[PDB]
């Protein structure tokens, strides 16, 4: 039913009350600080690649894999032998007078075998991930997730991998093909996802029924 209690994926308050700020210090200056947070050094001309645990990176999946395999074999043998007089000389009647030497035979053997296989997959999404840890060589372990609830169900797109901090180009973007340990999941929930399951009996027949 649609009246069953449910928790939206975007939990918690959707509003934030702005903080008034700090009362000025009567030091004679109009300028007033705002309690600086981060004191780390930041370069100016570098490409702002992710560098720490909290840094975020953009991943363009653009995955396209296609593999094919084919094989065939054949073998055909055909033979036919015949021999007949239909008229035998008087002197040769002893050996071929009757159908004794008359012979006819045929034989065939044809075999044909074939086999094939294909496997293709594609992925054309964009997902922003967050650094999980920094490796010894500087490579970043990136993990990210995105949940979308269009209506009547939810879809989770999760990505994980190791990104070398030199393939990141320009606007903090790196193709998924350049990420090692690529783990990509695109799963769904609800009756829409349930309708794509085989069913227990059909699955059992598929895994066990002969032929």
């Amino acid at each position: 039913c649609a009246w069953i209690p449910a928790k939206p994926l975007v939990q918690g308050a959707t509003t934030a009350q702005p903080i008034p700020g700090p009362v000025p210090v009567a030091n004679g200056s109009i300028f007033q600080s705002a309690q600086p947070i981060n004191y780390g050094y930041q370069p100016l001309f570098e490409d702002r690649r992710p560098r720490n645990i909290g840094d975020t990176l953009t991943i363009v999946l653009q995955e396209n894999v296609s593999a094919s395999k084919s094989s065939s074999a054949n073998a055909s043998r055909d033979g036919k032998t015949s021999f007949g007089f239909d008229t035998v000389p008087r002197y040769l009647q002893g050996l071929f007078g009757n159908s004794r030497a008359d012979m006819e035979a045929s034989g065939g053997n044809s075999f044909n075998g074939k086999g094939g296989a294909n496997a293709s997959n594609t992925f054309s999404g964009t997902l922003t991930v967050t650094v999980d840890q920094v490796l010894a060589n500087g490579n970043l372990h990136v993990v990210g997730e995105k949940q979308i609830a269009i209506n009547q169900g939810t879809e989770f797109i999760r990505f994980s991998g190791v990104v070398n901090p030199r393939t990141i180009s320009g606007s903090n973007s790196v193709p998924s093909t350049q990420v090692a340990d690529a783990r990509i999941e695109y799963v769904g929930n609800g009756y829409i996802n349930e309708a794509q399951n085989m069913g227990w009996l059909q699955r059992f027949f598929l895994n066990l029924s002969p032929m």
Binding site: P43, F45, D47, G170
Partner: peptide, 11 residues
């Protein structure tokens, strides 16, 4: 440039 921290687009 990439080693220093600047990644110029290939094209």
């Amino acid at each position: 440039l990439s080693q220093l921290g600047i990644t110029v687009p290939t094209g």
